[PDB]
Amino acid sequence: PFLNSSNYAELFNNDIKLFVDDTNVYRVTVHKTFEGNVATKAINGCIFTLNPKTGHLFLKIIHTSVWAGQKRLSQLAKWKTAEEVSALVRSLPKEEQPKQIIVTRKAMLDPLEVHMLDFPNIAIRPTELRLPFSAAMSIDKLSDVVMKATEPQMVLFNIYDDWLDRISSYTAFSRLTLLLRALKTNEESAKMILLSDPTITIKSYHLWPSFTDEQWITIESQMRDLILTEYGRKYNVNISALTQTEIKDIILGQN
Incomplete structure (x- = not known):
């Protein structure tokens, strides 16, 4: 339920x-x-x-x-x-x-x-x-x-x-929620992370830029850092040794 x-x-x-x-x-x-x-x-x-x-x-x-x-x-x-x-x-x-x-x-x-x-x-x-x-x-x-x-x-x-050609739905949902969380937390910072190359363009039929698998790795850690730094400034906590489950928690909502 x-x-x-x-x-x-x-x-x-x-x-x-x-x-x-x-x-x-x-x-x-x-x-x-x-x-x-x-x-x-x-x-x-x-x-x-x-x-x-x-x-x-x-x-x-x-x-x-x-x-x-x-x-x-x-x-x-x-x-x-x-x-x-x-x-x-x-x-x-x-x-x-x-x-x-x-x-x-x-x-x-x-x-x-x-x-x-x-x-x-x-x-x-x-x-x-x-x-x-x-x-x-x-x-x-x-x-x-x-x-x-x-x-x-x-x-x-x-x-x-077109991510699902390369990754699973679970991974795709993780990436989307991460991207949407960073935008909700800090829109202007998230958007500068995403728009910092324009050699990486967004296809006419797409929402997100055409990052390589390697560029996605860096992007997701930059989104992660954005969210965690704004969390560590709100709750006075060491955002390292923060557990992966706890990080996932912060991204999805939940407690």
Whole structure:
């Protein structure tokens, strides 16, 4: 029932699973108005729906038009996430339907359970992992598609690029969570780590740069150092002789 750092590996078996994160559905920006005051303004959001085995990201874009005439958009965003995840599952053949949907927030559990009633065989699960999927709006390609959206739409990506030709899903999920954690911890530092060569480019159909296997090794230790140094400055701890399990803990969330 609960997904934790202790039953984590089952995300990479052959039962189809999807993560659902609703953190970026209702988004605002703060601007100065025509009269010179300051105000919030809703901007486009997204539902982040991820198959951790395949890397398939179903990015459902939430156009600002959905908030029109509506009240209390933080509560309604939860129901809209459920409705949209339900519609996606419903569009899919029984073949490709998930056995489990894992929600990143426990507040999403109930709304999603209600909308998935017509799907008796799909389990809705919470997680003890505090996974960094919110950072998805720090990936420039994702950020861009969402903001250039003029209507509701659903865009598909492989969040692992072509990595699974070379590494396993377990390794790919480790790399992604590491990258997303560093972006959430320190966006500008993480982005300078990633963008420090532009001899290493990002392919048109990709999210991440085309690092070699050797360049990925250095990148992941630089992301690691970023997260651990900002942890060692927060908790006054020697981040060496920190156990690998403890490090993995810090990356996934959990305790």
